[PDB]
Amino acid sequence: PEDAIAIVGMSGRYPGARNVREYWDNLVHARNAIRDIPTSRWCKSMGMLDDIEHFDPLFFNIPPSEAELMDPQHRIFLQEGYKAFEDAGYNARTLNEKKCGVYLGIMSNEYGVMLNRQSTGNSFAIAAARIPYFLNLKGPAIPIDTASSSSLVGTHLARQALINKEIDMALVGGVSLYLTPESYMSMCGFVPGEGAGALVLKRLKDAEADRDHIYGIIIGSGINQDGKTNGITAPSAKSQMDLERDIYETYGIHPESISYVEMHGTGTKQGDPIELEALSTVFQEKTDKKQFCAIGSVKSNIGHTSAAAGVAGVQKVLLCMNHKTLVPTLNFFEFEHSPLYVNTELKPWETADGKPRRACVSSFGYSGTNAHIVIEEYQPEKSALFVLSAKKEKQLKAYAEAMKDFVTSNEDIDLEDMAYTLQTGREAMDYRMAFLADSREMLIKALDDYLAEMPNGSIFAAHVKTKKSEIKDHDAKALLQTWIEKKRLEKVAELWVKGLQIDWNKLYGEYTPRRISLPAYPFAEEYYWLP
Amino acid sequence: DAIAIVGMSGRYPGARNVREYWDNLVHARNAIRDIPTSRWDVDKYCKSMGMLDDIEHFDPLFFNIPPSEAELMDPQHRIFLQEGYKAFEDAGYNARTLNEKKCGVYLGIMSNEYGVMLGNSFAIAAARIPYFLNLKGPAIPIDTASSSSLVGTHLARQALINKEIDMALVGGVSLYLTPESYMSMCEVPGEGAGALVLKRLKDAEADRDHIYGIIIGSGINQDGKTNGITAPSAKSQMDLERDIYETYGIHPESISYVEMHGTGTKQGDPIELEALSTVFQEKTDKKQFCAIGSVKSNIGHTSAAAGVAGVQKVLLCMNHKTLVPTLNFEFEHSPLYVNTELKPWETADGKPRRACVSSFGYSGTNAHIVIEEYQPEKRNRSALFVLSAKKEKQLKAYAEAMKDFVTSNEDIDLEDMAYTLQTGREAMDYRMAFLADSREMLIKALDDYLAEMPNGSIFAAHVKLFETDHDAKALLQTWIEKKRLEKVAELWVKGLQIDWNKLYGEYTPRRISLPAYPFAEEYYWLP
């Protein structure tokens, strides 16, 4: 049991959703993001990402000329993988030399082909390794290609390595794009889908000790093969049942405790009756209770997203748990006498009696390698100085807008958690701004003044350069401390924007706030494609 | 806990199998050659490679694959199907006994060229064996460039220890089908394909598998930030090695050979030396007690297959208690020496030999494992030899491989051989059987069969009221207990299923390594 794995960070980019918050808002409103394929790229519809050519190579210390040579899958994953770490409240400083493994679901290598007719950089290997190379992580970095089960197979491997104590953190993800018509048509009536997502995992006990924010807990997982089926793309009912049963047995999970399953299938393809029967039979081995478990699939919203399917599904489940809300599955065997029902409504996600909500995700690929994972709701033991920095001023401004939007959408935000998170959970980069605020309304006002260039005496800003501070010595340091303990946050703000390193923990005595989810770095949006 | 290696098969430059491989290493053969035109023209684009031969050859029918589909199959997939399959037979397992096993498959593979030249995903590559044999453990390709097969080994080990699977097939395959992929990798590339079969040690002992050696530790990690992604990290290598020795309680003084990642002559190689040497020195002042080398000096740098090629070299050295040369920093004050000799591999009294293998890749993901010699417990007339193939021509070819093997192996235990042929091979449709009670009679029967000598001593047929009738079954049994092996032979070649265990009373023989299926050498390339 105390082999529980916490999910402490997430980031996701899917058709119709540039981030996890849009994603949620789309699911809540039952939005279908599938569109007709346009000429700009080249059945006839697809869940597509937008602006797949955009990248911020300088952020990652990659020359612009090399960006053109990078598979966009690699680029987009670097970006999302990175943002997941910030979502968790981790930065370059705090990640440097961590034994963080990286497990990257990825199943196509098309861009490299496209280029070699003009001309290695675009291997699966290098894809997995870009993040560790950028952030100096020390856990293994392994791409996983099991077709559509990839990101969920990666999740299982990460879980096992954490439980074994071989790593102390994992980044697991997936990414899929269809850059040629050929790659589309390899999928498929699977409406093929694009996407890219990442999760950050730690052992639960480390997540609690370090005071991470915890979206949920993985309490079981397993993987297996179909073996011999009637054609390699056809599923095995027995293999699915064995998978599910073996996980529930191994980790002592009673099927009655499970109230949602994020299916592999949409309900409407060839293999999908089998998935339904298998799950239902395994549940019925242990209970005569009827229609207590909702099922659905986000593939009805965003298409069948290949290697990223697992991470997209997990993220949906976590978002449902966090809001205690089940959301429709779109356009979906004898349900009446089964444990299952198809949830087509937006409704509260109910629990029995304080018991945490539990859900599964399934992900089964064309090559017959299957994965299934069980997730449990985490049930916690439940003037500020705001700082923002970016590597270019234009990105700093975009940061301040993303923060303003977030505060405006989220009347509930705890201001002290937000500031603490901005202090300790983001890297101080060269273009810097800071301000004081004691209420939500003051906070919005400062951000608005900063954006509108309205003077405001609570706002400070500078570009680091190579500054001339006499403090960095003894008597000056003692004064800084004096300012902290007297809460002269103006003075702290002023110096911090000019480049002075502040030990943020000293701002806090009795009460220490918590890192929470905030929007992550707003990457430049620069175009790079085949030279 | 301990993982047994119970089967292996390998195909490397200059070596069609693991027996030629050994013979090549013992004689210090270098299999690297000039690239010929049949591959491509080097002059239109260095110039040598460790190459496999007949990379186009495949037996699609054996695997229930249409000939036309073979042409569409990447030869990497084809060759691994063959070697992976043979590793199972090397262990003494067949379709019948593998059906529905939770055997996982971990396949190191790093290039997809044939598909471009034109089903051929890494995913499908890993999965062809499970689909053919109906295995139920996960099937996962691994691409960490050159560390791939050794990273796969680590993942298999962990899954076995956790009890998620009960067997693993781990392997690697690399070919250079275009000048482009050769040149890139090159910033001497080697081809190859190999597999190992792994089980928990306790299951291997209970099932009476033959055990080449034991994996006693492994780990994997990442260089992280280096000066360019292809450059190594001295610290990561030391942390890797140290963390493994500490975690699994292995003292460096117990280690007497290390199969290096590098040959000793390339950019990153001074770093590998210094890292390993430093870690060893943290624990001992002993000097020059650990030999080092690399089979890449013999067969080229074999990419994804490097790990399995290295592990196999180590096992073969342990089995023969022999260290072999490596071909072509201040050693004197180090724990290490470069072994350039063919010499006996010594241990201080009793203790099992221990060795490591390292495998680093262009993407910075490193693996290292520690292997220990297996030391079996002491063990406590006519035998019936049976051979079968799916085509008569392969049966004949099988007869010749067995004859060569018996001829080369003057101390084979005949009973173990027959038992292995009985219980450790599938009975296929073209069948032959004979009796023999000595090595020389065994060779003679095989020779007569090949020469189609009217013998009467040899039974053969192409596939039966001993199935239906109660009293007929009883008679068969009566024949067994009276050791009327001629009668058993006769019926078996016609298709009667025999319960081989009944031939054995209180003394049961053991499965050993024998040559594995001789695939039909049929050419398939681009349609």
**Which residue matches tokens 């901005």?**
A422
Are A369 and B136 inside 8 Å of each other by CB?
A: no
Whether B271 contacts chain A with CB within 8 A: no
Write b or e for each residue in B492-525: b if 16 or more Cβ atoms lie within 10 A of its Cβ, otherwise e: bbeeeebebeebeeeeebbbebbbbbbbbeeebe
From first CA to last CA, the distance across chain B in angstroms is 49
- Among B103, B111, B363, most A C-beta atoms within 10 A, so best to mutate, is B363
> Solving technique for this entry?
X-ray
Are B136 and A224 inside 8 Å of each other by CB?
A: yes
- Among B140, B164, B244, most A C-beta atoms within 10 A, so best to mutate, is B140
Q: Residue ranges of the domains in chain B?
A: 1-379, 380-505
Where helices occur in B320-465 by DSSP H, the ranges are 392-408, 414-423, 439-451
Whether A220 contacts chain B with CB within 8 A: no
Are B127 and A161 inside 8 Å of each other by CB?
A: no
Domain B1-379 sits in CATH at 3.40.47.10
- Show which of residues 159-188 on chain B sit within 8 Å of chain A, judged by CB atoms: 159, 162, 164, 180-181, 184
Count of positions (residues) in chain B: 527
Q: Closest partner residue to A140 among B133, B135, B151, by Cβ?
A: B151
The data reach a resolution, in angstroms, of: 2.2
Residues 6+ away with beta carbon under 8 Å from B181: A120, B111, B113
Distance CA A45, CA B116 (A): 26
List beta partners, residue B522: B58
Q: Domain A1-416+511-531: give its CATH superfamily.
A: Thiolase/Chalcone synthase (3.40.47.10)
What is the distance of C-alpha A203 from the center of its chain? 17
- Whether the CB-CB separation of B509 and B379 falls below 8 Å is answered with no
Are A128 and B139 inside 8 Å of each other by CB?
A: no
Where helices occur in A410-473 by DSSP H, the ranges are 415-424, 440-452
From the CA of B189, how many Å to the nearest CA of chain A?
A: 14
Q: Which residues from chain B sit within 8 angstroms of residue A140, using beta carbons?
A: 144, 151, 220-222, 365-366
Nearest CA in chain A to B366: A140
From the CA of B479, how many Å to the nearest CA of chain A?
A: 38
Q: Which two tokens stand for residue B128?
A: 């062809």
Residues 6+ away with beta carbon under 8 Å from B452: none
Instruction: Look up residue B190 and give its DSSP letter.
Output: B
Whether B107 contacts chain A with CB within 8 A: no
Distance CA B377, CA B383 (A): 25
Q: Closest partner residue to A142 among B142, B159, B226, by Cβ?
A: B142
From the CA of B358, how many Å to the nearest CA of chain A?
A: 15
Strands B213-222 and B257-259: unpaired
Whether A125 contacts chain B with CB within 8 A: yes
User: Which contacts of A38-45 are long-range, i.e. CB under 8 A and separated by 24 or more positions?
Assistant: A42/A180, A42/A181, A43/A188, A43/A189, A43/A191, A45/A191, A45/A303
Whether A456 contacts chain B with CB within 8 A: no
- Whether the CB-CB separation of A31 and A301 falls below 8 Å is answered with yes
A266: left (phi over 0), alpha (psi -120 to 50) or beta: alpha
What sign does the dihedral B140-A367-A317-A277 (CA atoms) show?
negative
Closest-CA residue to A199 (of A10, A12, A372, A363): A10
Residues 6+ away with beta carbon under 8 Å from B404: none
- Whether the CB-CB separation of A390 and A396 falls below 8 Å is answered with yes
From first CA to last CA, the distance across chain A in angstroms is 52
Q: Which residues from chain A sit within 8 angstroms of residue B364, using beta carbons?
A: 129, 132-133, 141
Q: What is the CA radius of gyration of chain A?
A: 24
What is the distance of C-alpha A3 from the center of its chain? 22
Closest-CA residue to A158 (of A175, A145, A135, A139): A139
- Whether the CB-CB separation of A81 and A416 falls below 8 Å is answered with no
Q: Closest partner residue to A116 among B132, B180, B219, by Cβ?
A: B180
- Whether the CB-CB separation of A193 and A37 falls below 8 Å is answered with no
Residues 6+ away with beta carbon under 8 Å from B3: B156, B157, B160, B161, B198, B199, B200, B201, B214, B215
